[PDB]
Amino acid sequence: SKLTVVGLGYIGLPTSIMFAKHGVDVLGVDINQQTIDKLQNGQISIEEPGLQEVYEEVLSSGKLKVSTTPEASDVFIIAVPTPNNDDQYRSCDISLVMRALDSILPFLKKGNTIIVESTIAPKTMDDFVKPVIENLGFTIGEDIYLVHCPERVLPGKILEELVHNNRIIGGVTKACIEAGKRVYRTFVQGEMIETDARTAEMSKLMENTYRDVNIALANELTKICNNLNINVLDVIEMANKHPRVNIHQPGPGVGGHCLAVDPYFIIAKDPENAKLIQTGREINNSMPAYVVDTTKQIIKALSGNKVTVFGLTYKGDVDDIRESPAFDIYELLNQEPDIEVCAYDPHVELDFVEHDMSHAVKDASLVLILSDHSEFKNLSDSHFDKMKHKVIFDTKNVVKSSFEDVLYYNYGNIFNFI
Amino acid sequence: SKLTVVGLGYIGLPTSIMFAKHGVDVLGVDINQQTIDKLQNGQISIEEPGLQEVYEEVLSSGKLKVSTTPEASDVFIIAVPTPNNDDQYRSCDISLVMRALDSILPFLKKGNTIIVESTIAPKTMDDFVKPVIENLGFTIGEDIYLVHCPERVLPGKILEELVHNNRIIGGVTKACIEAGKRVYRTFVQGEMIETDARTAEMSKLMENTYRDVNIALANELTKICNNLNINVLDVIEMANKHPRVNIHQPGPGVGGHCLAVDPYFNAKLIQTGREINNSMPAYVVDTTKQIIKALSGNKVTVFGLTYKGDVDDIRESPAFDIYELLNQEPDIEVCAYDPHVELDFVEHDMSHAVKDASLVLILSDHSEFKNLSDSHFDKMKHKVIFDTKNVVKSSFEDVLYYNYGNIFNFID
Numbered sequence: 001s002k003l004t005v006v007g008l009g010y011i012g013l014p015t016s017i018m019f020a021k022h023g024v025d026v027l028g029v030d031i032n033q034q035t036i037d038k039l040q041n042g043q044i045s046i047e048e049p050g051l052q053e054v055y056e057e058v059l060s061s062g063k064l065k066v067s068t069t070p071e072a073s074d075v076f077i078i079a080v081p082t083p084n085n086d087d088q089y090r091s092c093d094i095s096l097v098m099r100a101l102d103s104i105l106p107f108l109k110k111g112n113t114i115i116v117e118s119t120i121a122p123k124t125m126d127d128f129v130k131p132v133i134e135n136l137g138f139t140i141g142e143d144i145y146l147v148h149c150p151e152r153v154l155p156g157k158i159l160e161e162l163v164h165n166n167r168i169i170g171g172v173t174k175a176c177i178e179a180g181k182r183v184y185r186t187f188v189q190g191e192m193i194e195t196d197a198r199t200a201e202m203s204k205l206m207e208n209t210y211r212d213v214n215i216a217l218a219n220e221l222t223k224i225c226n227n228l229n230i231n232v233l234d235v236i237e238m239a240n241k242h243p244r245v246n247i248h249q250p251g252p253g254v255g256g257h258c259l260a261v262d263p264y265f266i267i268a269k270d271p272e273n274a275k276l277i278q279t280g281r282e283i284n285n286s287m288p289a290y291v292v293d294t295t296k297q298i299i300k301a302l303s304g305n306k307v308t309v310f311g312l313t314y315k316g317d318v319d320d321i322r323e324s325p326a327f328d329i330y331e332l333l334n335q336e337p338d339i340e341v342c343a344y345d346p347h348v349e350l351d352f353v354e355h356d357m358s359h360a361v362k363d364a365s366l367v368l369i370l371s372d373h374s375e376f377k378n379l380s381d382s383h384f385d386k387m388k389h390k391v392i393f394d395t396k397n398v399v400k401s402s403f404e405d406v407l408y409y410n411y412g413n414i415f416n417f418i
Numbered sequence: 419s420k421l422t423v424v425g426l427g428y429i430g431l432p433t434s435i436m437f438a439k440h441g442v443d444v445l446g447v448d449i450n451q452q453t454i455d456k457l458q459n460g461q462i463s464i465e466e467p468g469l470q471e472v473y474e475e476v477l478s479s480g481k482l483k484v485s486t487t488p489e490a491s492d493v494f495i496i497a498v499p500t501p502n503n504d505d506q507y508r509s510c511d512i513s514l515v516m517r518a519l520d521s522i523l524p525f526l527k528k529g530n531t532i533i534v535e536s537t538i539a540p541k542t543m544d545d546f547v548k549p550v551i552e553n554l555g556f557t558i559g560e561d562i563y564l565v566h567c568p569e570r571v572l573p574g575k576i577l578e579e580l581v582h583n584n585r586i587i588g589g590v591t592k593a594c595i596e597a598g599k600r601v602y603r604t605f606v607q608g609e610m611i612e613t614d615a616r617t618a619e620m621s622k623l624m625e626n627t628y629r630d631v632n633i634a635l636a637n638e639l640t641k642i643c644n645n646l647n648i649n650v651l652d653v654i655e656m657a658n659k660h661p662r663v664n665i666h667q668p669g670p671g672v673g674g675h676c677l678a679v680d681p682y683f684n685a686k687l688i689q690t691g692r693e694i695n696n697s698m699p700a701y702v703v704d705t706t707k708q709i710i711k712a713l714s715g716n717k718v719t720v721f722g723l724t725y726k727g728d729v730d731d732i733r734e735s736p737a738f739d740i741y742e743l744l745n746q747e748p749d750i751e752v753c754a755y756d757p758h759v760e761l762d763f764v765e766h767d768m769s770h771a772v773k774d775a776s777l778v779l780i781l782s783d784h785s786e787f788k789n790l791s792d793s794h795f796d797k798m799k800h801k802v803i804f805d806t807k808n809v810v811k812s813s814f815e816d817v818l819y820y821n822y823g824n825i826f827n828f829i830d
């Protein structure tokens with residue numbers, strides 16, 4: 001048993017380290033010479049706790065070797081990025097999987113297994129991958145095995161997730177399913193959910209679509225509830241008491257790498273039919289503007305100009321931005337000339353970001369909480385003493401503590417100020 | 419103690435039967451003399467398993483009396499229908515509730531309790547009910563008590579749910595909450611969820627909105643999946659393996675229900691969801707045409723005319739909407755088979771309905787459809803089923819079975 005991994009990023013690198021730790025002879029392949037040199041030198045390319053340690057032993061074992069050129073293997077894994085095409089429908093860009101596939105093609109031998117771990121649009125495996133392979137003479141389920149196994153990981157111990165998480169084996173043939181089951185069985189303690197390529201592709205993208213549409217509903221309800229002087233949050237809690245009702249929570253928008261990427265892979269496949277998914281996307285995309293307009297309303301009624309943003313990340317307790325509605329709000333609030341913007345975020349390290357809470361809140365006429373950081377769960381009137389007007393507008397409903405001098409506004413209270 | 423229920427249908431009648439069964443002197447009111455006469459004669463107006471039996475004893479006890487006119491009571495319960503204001507919004511027509519409110523107004527006395535059990539649009543209790551009452555001289559939380567307690571009925575386990583299910587008492591004042599609690603405490607073993615009128619109103623509507631939007635997603639996926647030659651049903655089952663993913667099932671549309679929208683109307687997602695669910699009858703009709711184009715004949719047998727399975731309600735039914743459309747189509751011969759629907763144009767015998775039919779279209783999830791063999795469909799011209807509710811669980815040999823996940827296989 002020999003294995004190749006094409007694309008050695010947040011997915012590829014840990015996948016290589018996992019198979020090599022488990023005795024498989026692994027070749028790691030990347031377009032980046034920087035990444036290759038850095039790995040050949042003995043250093044990991046991505047920031048992950050204790051991964052550098054597990055890599056060290058693995059590279060010394062001779063079980064992991066990194067090249068820019070693939071070689072004949074028993075199994076090939078494509079873990080390259082899938083960007084959202086600049087276009088109207090934000091189509092899946094399968095362009096990177098296609099060139100990775102091309103690089104694998106000359107080293108293919110009968111009996112081999114190809115795995116696409118990258119997020120792909122429905123019918124990619126069948127209408128794009130399958131043809132290119134079958135054309136060489138190979139026959140899916142006989143000479144070669146095609147599997148889509150969408151790999152997703154939280155930087156909260158990626159290796160742990162690689163072992164224990166439930167996996168979807170989406171093979172082109174029932175044979176491809178067995179071939180892919182054979183491959184992940186080396187370390188997967190989790191369940192091997194058997195299905196065909198198209199279902200595994202559609203299903204994975206459905207998981208993020210159900211989420212996005214259901215957040216779009218909660219966000220839309222917040223807009224309706226605020227105009228009707230109804231507490232959206234109290235309403236969601238009531239209605240959710242029904243076993244068949246699972247209304248999601250509102251927020252400052254929908255960022256995430258997957259959460260905003262994935263629903264667009266479905267739209268682009270049949271744009272005229274995906275009206276609900278599109279609408280869902282528009283509503284979630286409008287939340288930064290809804291928050292900015294509300295922020296503008298608050299500062300007009302009060303004297304002060306300064307507003308302190310609390311949270312710049314897409315998720316709580318992460319130092320990751322890049323895919324954040326919280327950053328989008330800050331950027332917009334800054335651009336507004338009649339608004340003075342002050343940053344505050346304990347997780348990410350940046351130049352324009354203030355790290356002493358008191359100086360950030362100093363003379364501020366609003367605290368716009370945008371991320372659900374655990375540090376925000378407990379906050380007293382003392383933290384906000386330096387403010388011009390002690391008033392918080394929480395969009396993530398993270399503040400659980402009690403206030404006396406501070407005016408607290410949720411997505412369920414904001415109509416009480418306006 | 420005297421209680422008055424205005425409207426004796428699927429809600430009002432069981433509510434009357436429950437309070438009377440618990441020793442309250444109940445006065446059932448309905449606008450329909452037929453319903454009044456049948457109840458006075460000793461027969462229930464709605465089809466429900468252990469209900470005619472519990473009514474019999476209750477009527478004999480003298481605890482339940484039915485009139486067309488209300489009278490002074492200690493508590494008034496409005497359980498009239500709330501139709502949809504004809505929109506792609508599906509707002510709440512409160513006119514029947516407002517009608518019922520008028521009919522009770524002259525019998526109001528200080529200390530009384532008014533309960534609106536009907537589904538109402540947000541801020542109804544505050545902007546519509548509250549003013550009309552306060553105008554007479556009454557003061558909410560002092561003279562009289564206004565409560566919105568939206569029901570949730572499950573035909574079959576109706577009376578059982580009436581006792582064990584958790585209830586939302588939505589009072590205009592904290593006093594109104596206590597007043598409504600005194601009433602339901604006579605039989606409610608379940609929890610009394612204390613809240614204000616607007617939250618109780620908005621939540622029932624939200625419960626309905628989550629459902630509609632989530633069905634609109636499953637229906638939209640079916641349209642996408644069929645064009646991509648993917649099985650929607652297999653996809654839903656896979657994705658639902660995730661604990662925080664609960665994709666709903668597709669269907670032949672969504673039957674009439676009030677939504678979390680203010681009638682004054684933006685509400686883009688709820689509107690879109692409504693349009694998609696409203697297009698399902700046409701999608702099914704178009705698919706039916708296609709099936710009939712590839713086969714010979716014109717006959718198609720519609721199996722189910724109701725919005726829900728094991729019910730007789732044809733009101734605002736997508737199954738009825740399909741039948742109506744299929745009839746209107748000149749190149750199509752239509753036949754309706756529903757065991758629960760007592761109507762003139764509806765065929766009683768399954769064999770005569772399927773006789774020379776080129777297609778059998780299942781539109782309702784009736785328990786009788788769960789188990790079906792090739793023998794039932796022997797009289798057909800072409801033995802082929804297009805199930806929209808995925809109710810058929812049984813196995814076939816000569817019959818061609820199609821689902822929302824299979825239709826693309828009929829080579830179209």
Ligand SMILES: NC(=O)c1ccc[n+]([C@@H]2O[C@H](COP(=O)([O-])OP(=O)(O)OC[C@H]3O[C@@H](n4cnc5c(N)ncnc54)[C@H](O)[C@@H]3O)[C@@H](O)[C@H]2O)c1
Nearest residue numbers: 007008009010011030031032080081082100118119152153
């Ligand atoms: N970020 C995640 O943990 C995550 C979560 C969900 C889904 N995914 C899916 O996996 C994909 C990859 O994510 P990632 O975080 O590993 O990306 P990444 O940027 O961290 O790594 C991609 C790597 O592939 C290399 N590469 C690109 N094209 C190549 C080619 N043609 N041949 C060889 N190497 C090539 C790049 O140099 C880079 O090192 C995502 O785009 C998405 O489809 C990832």
Ligand SMILES: NC(=O)c1ccc[n+]([C@@H]2O[C@H](COP(=O)([O-])OP(=O)(O)OC[C@H]3O[C@@H](n4cnc5c(N)ncnc54)[C@H](O)[C@@H]3O)[C@@H](O)[C@H]2O)c1
Nearest residue numbers: 425426427428429448449450498499500517518536537571
């Ligand atoms: N069908 C259900 O079990 C159900 C489920 C959810 C919500 N609801 C809510 O309850 C409402 C009623 O449902 P239902 O199934 O009982 O309807 P229904 O048609 O079975 O009964 C309504 C009864 O009220 C009577 N009526 C109408 N207007 C009246 C008036 N102004 N004065 C006196 N009587 C009047 C009618 O004659 C009829 O007998 C629904 O529209 C909805 O708001 C019902």
